[PDB]
């Protein structure tokens, strides 16, 4: 069939069209010469609402974050050149962490192409390896299928982003031609066969297991039944639950078969419970190197069973370029996961208990806890503390509670202490680690979820990557509360600094600017805190405070986030924290630095 | 033959020894994981200083203001993941304008290299579109050899940006063997030939044009070598908009800029010439015009083999890329223009044509709407007040500036007399340039008083380097030409598409109060008569400070060509259209702007 409905419009208008029909309610852009047919185009459309930043890397970070609170994907629009290139550090952090996003960039004339015009760049080569797929629209006739496309790509299989090229002259030319009808509207029974093949197998060694774990990961919240279906899958088969970073919110951390987060600074208990499982049911996970620990020394007990066809370890993975990366697993489940959970359930033998079991992991559990150097008498404030605290007070107003931040030890406590319940809350750049992330994101989270209390609890170094976004966050109405732990260091560095490199701080002390000043000056609120018995006032006054604030929090300086496996340490072999090893630490840095750290 | 200097070293503190052999005084990055090795080497280093940054674009940016104006190539280092990915803004625009920069990028060990590793990126792949040069670095064996081909690289031809990917496991490796020796220490007929046909061309030239670009700031006797030239054969120099300050515009025999937006005078005499000697520019689209309209006169007088165009380029590449040349001169500009210059007859005058230049430079001046009592300042005569209050302090100033309409007026209503003293993102056109280029040219010039003239959307951009102006120690000047706008693009929604300004308007901070913040003075001024005032004391300030000025809105950049307008189809200022237009936008944007 044949479309003529487009015949007439312009790229742009063609453009704006697609955006209501790919059922996009929000962009994330910033104009440019280049994509000006396109802003003109969508010149006080009402199809959706436009945020702009005041960096294109700013509307990138907040279109993940939207993605990520949202579930929809986060649609960027920037121009050619700089513009472009702005948005690759966005891109590859969604590729990293499989966020859906579809990049529009606008680009010179196709005429002009290849030859060095003002603001041109090789955007489609240079996101090559940063997204899921990309294209440089050579034509109006194909621009609804390419955006289709786009759409479709960024959304399937392991969401991620994807990249649309848009000449100049593509944009602003009117569609002269009628085109396909197919190109401008957004299983195998042999494969289900065998998928259903894998579901047996998964279940058949789930019902042998005597000390089962679940793996989980952000894969099961790419479904609205993800969590319950897991949840289900737990109390069913009595199976304890750890969850890795991107995986924090899908289980009830309430419930007491909850490991809470495993890896390089996971819960002690989660790694044990994973060193010592017969069998790992790994849901959505992908066992990148933050939580294998050395992979020759990876769940050993799994690995016995396996030998033994007693268990080993079980797959739940979408994209096939994951199954079997890392580890060899014993049964891979191709899908969905959540999908495939609902299959097996009528599968798995129903079990009343598993005292020896539970019995040991509960040992563990008054053993390992997430202990750290509380406040003493005329001492500074401890970031574990405020992220506790926080938890609490946030919890309590009862509102639905989403939490950004940016990367290093604040992340990580915040991650650790925070009590997670609710799936969707947790946005965090995990696999690229981008600083800057927690302001953006937050202020793009916002807007996906207006009725939200949307918290970035950030780090000092990471704030000033993106703080020029806090005049952003003003003009799109997006009352977000910033939250800066401010240890004057970037301490995941200076950690790594301390424990490998005999306390030899190489440049990682920055120079802040006054935060509460600077939030005044941006439009907002500014509160600061250094005194512990002005803390809970403090963080009653932000989070009930109306409209966009930000709380600086002074906190003790070179303090290391504990547990810590790292190099070629095993899970079990992890680094526990010690208040009389913490002390000789510290007069030895003291020493080490010339007394300047 | 073999050299052991380096046995028993990590890559790092290999590292830390070839900055030095490469001359290198200053290094612009962020650290990160994998590039711990290398920064726990050049720990307390005492080989160079460091310049920290809070966001690894503005190192980049930092790095190719120090290379502008020291001659220096820039050096970076970066981790991997993020830390690589953000510098690819700076590489595409020092990639663009041809600046020396040699960028050093941490990486994951090479045993998780292809596994998705933490913070782990195809760097080589994603910069090689914006490298002259780049490569992985497999062992410490080749670290010298890898460092020695990237200086050598980004400083030779046209220079430009490398990229050295370390993997953190060969930098945290000790060199054990011995090395090659060499791999650790940093035709000509056709040439001579076409630079004799172009000295005949140039005697047989009734109306020559100079058209002069950044390529004759890559030699420091370029400047001297091209006023030499003007002299003895009285040629009109024009320069591009990266030429500024490689001819002195009190010269009479200046044309000013030429371009898009560049002087009616230099257009017309490019367009009427009947010989175009390109030295040391690329004939870039925002020169040009319309390209089949460009230099009509040199196309008739090559047909008739009494003129055309003469081109002086080091990359073969760009020799008839453009516009089909008559003689092409390879190599360094400044070298071949020195042995030409016997081969050149001293013309004593030229009446006919400096009569007609003249002519236009009296009808055809910058001229915009001066201020009135009652109204707002006009961003030009900030410009040209500035130029001269920075003058009368006898130093020398150098000058960077953001993307837009304020860094056109900052280029046409200047006074550029000096080399190395205008450093300008114009290729790629980066916003946010001017600060931290600023930076990193105070930094190369630490007696100097270094100016950023930057437009409120330009400066929002990169903002958050203010802090490190602060403990970087540079007293860098930032001015705030604040029209609430992108001037630019709003320039071309009124031109081309009926006053629809599409978001265009963002919500600007309290730059005095944002200033202070971050640890500098913060000036403000709104009135005509306190405009002197505050530019003498923003100048005379000691350390960095921050002066905003609310400029008038929506006045357009002129002259203009655009579209299919050839240099000599250019709109020209006029008082009684603009108070038409102005009362145009008003009726369509309901009174809002
Ligand atoms: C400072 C720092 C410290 C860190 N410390 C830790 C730590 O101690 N512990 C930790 O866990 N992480 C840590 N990380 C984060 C870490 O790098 C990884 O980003 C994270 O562990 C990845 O978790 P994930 O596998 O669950 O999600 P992803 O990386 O997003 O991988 C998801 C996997 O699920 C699959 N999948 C996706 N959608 C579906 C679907 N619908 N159905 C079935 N399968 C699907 C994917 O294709 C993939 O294989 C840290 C990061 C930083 C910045
Ligand atoms: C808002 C905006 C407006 C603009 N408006 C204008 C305008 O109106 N007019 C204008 O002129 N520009 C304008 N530009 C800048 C423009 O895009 C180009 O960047 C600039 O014209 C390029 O000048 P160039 O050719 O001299 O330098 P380059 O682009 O750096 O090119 C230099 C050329 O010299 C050659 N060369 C280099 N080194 C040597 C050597 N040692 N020996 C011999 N040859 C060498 C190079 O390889 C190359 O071909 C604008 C940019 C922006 C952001
Ligand atoms: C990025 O610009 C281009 O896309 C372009 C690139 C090369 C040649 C011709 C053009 S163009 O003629 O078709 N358009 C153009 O120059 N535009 C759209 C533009 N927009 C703005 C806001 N400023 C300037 O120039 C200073 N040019
Ligand atoms: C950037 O990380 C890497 O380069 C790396 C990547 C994949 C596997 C192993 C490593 S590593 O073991 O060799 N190093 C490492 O993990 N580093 C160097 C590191 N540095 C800092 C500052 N934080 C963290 O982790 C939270 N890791
Ligand atoms: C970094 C960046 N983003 C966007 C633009 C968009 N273009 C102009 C010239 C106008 S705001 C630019 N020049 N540089
Ligand atoms: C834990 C990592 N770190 C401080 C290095 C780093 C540098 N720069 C950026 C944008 N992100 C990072 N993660
Ligand atoms: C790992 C990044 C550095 O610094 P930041 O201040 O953002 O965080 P933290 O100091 O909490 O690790
Ligand atoms: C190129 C446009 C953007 O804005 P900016 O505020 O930097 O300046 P101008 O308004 O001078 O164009
Ligand atoms: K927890
Ligand atoms: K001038
Ligand atoms: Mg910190
Ligand atoms: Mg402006």
Same mark, same amino acid.
Request: no cysteine; hydrophobic share 30%.
């Given at each position: 069939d044949m479309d003529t409905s487009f015949v007439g419009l312009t790229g742009g208008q063609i453009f704006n069209e697609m955006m209501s029909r790919q059922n996009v309610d929000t962009v994330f852009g910033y104009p440019g010469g280049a994509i000006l047919p396109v802003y003109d185009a969508i010149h006080?459309?009402?199809?959706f609402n436009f945020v702009l930043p005041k960096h294109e890397q700013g509307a990138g970070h907040m279109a993940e974050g939207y993605a990520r609170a949202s579930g929809k994907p986060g649609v960027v629009l920037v121009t050619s050149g700089p513009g472009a290139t702005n948005v690759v550090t966005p891109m590859a952090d969604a590729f990293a962490d499989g966020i859906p996003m579809v990049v529009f960039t606008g680009q010179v004339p196709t005429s002009a192409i290849?030859?060095?015009?003002? !603001? &041109?760049?090789d955007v489609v080569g240079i996101s090559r390896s940063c997204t899921k797929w990309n294209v440089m629209v050579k034509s109006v006739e194909e621009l609804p299928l390419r955006i289709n496309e786009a759409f479709e790509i960024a959304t399937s299989g392991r969401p991620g982003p994807v990249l649309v090229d848009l000449p100049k002259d593509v944009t602003a030319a009117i569609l002269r031609n009628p085109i396909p009808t197919k190109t401008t509207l957004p299983t195998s029974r042999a494969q289900d066969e065998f998928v259903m093949q894998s579901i047996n197998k998964a279940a058949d060694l789930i019902n042998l297991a005597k000390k089962p774990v679940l793996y989980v990961g952000?894969?099961?919240?790419?479904?609205?039944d993800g969590p319950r279906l897991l949840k289900e899958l737990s109390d069913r088969a009595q199976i304890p639950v750890t969850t890795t970073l991107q995986g924090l919110?899908?289980?009830? !951390? &309430?419930?007491?078969k909850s490991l809470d987060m495993l890896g390089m600074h996971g819960c002690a208990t989660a790694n044990l419970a994973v060193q010592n499982a017969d069998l790992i049911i790994a849901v959505?996970?992908?066992?990148?190197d933050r939580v294998t620990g050395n992979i020759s020394k990876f769940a050993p007990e799994a690995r016995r069973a396996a030998a033994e066809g007693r268990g080993g370890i079980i797959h739940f993975e979408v994209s096939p370029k994951n199954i079997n990366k890392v580890v060899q697993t014993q049964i891979a489940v191709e899908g969905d996961a959540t999908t495939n959970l609902g299959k097996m359930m009528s599968k798995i033998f129903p079990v009343k208990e598993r005292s020896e079991w539970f019995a040991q992991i509960n040992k563990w559990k008054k053993e390992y806890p997430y202990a750290y150097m509380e406040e003493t008498p005329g001492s500074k404030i401890k970031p574990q503390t405020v992220i506790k605290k926080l938890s609490k007070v946030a919890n309590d107003t009862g509102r639905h509670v989403i939490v950004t931040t940016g990367v290093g030890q604040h992340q990580m406590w915040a991650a650790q202490h925070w009590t997670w319940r609710n799936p969707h809350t947790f946005i965090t750049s995990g696999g690229?680690?981008?600083?800057?992330?927690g302001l953006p994101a937050a202020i793009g989270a916002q807007v996906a979820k207006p009725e939200s209390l949307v918290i970035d609890i950030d780090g000092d170094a990471s704030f000033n990557?993106?703080?020029?976004?806090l005049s952003s966050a003003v003009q799109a109405g997006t009352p977000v509360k910033i939250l800066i732990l401010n240890n004057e260091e970037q301490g995941m560095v200076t950690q790594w600094q301390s424990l490998?490199?005999?306390?030899?701080?190489?440049?990682?002390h920055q120079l802040n600017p006054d935060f509460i000043k600077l939030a005044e000056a941006m439009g907002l609120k500014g509160l600061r805190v250094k005194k512990q018995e002005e803390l809970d006032a403090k963080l009653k006054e932000f989070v009930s405070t109306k409209g966009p604030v930000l709380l600086e929090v002074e906190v003790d300086k070179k303090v290391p986030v504990l547990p810590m496996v790292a190099g070629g340490?095993?899970?079990?072999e992890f680094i526990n924290f010690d208040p009389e090893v913490e002390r000789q630490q510290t007069e030895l840095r003291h020493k080490r630095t010339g007394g300047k750290h």
């Open positions: 006080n459309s009402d199809k290849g030859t060095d015009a003002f !603001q &041109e760049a952000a894969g099961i919240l790419n479904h609205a919110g899908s289980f009830d !951390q &309430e419930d007491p959505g996970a992908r066992f990148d690229l680690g981008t600083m800057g992330y990557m993106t703080l020029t976004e490998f490199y005999e306390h030899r701080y190489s440049h990682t340490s095993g899970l079990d």
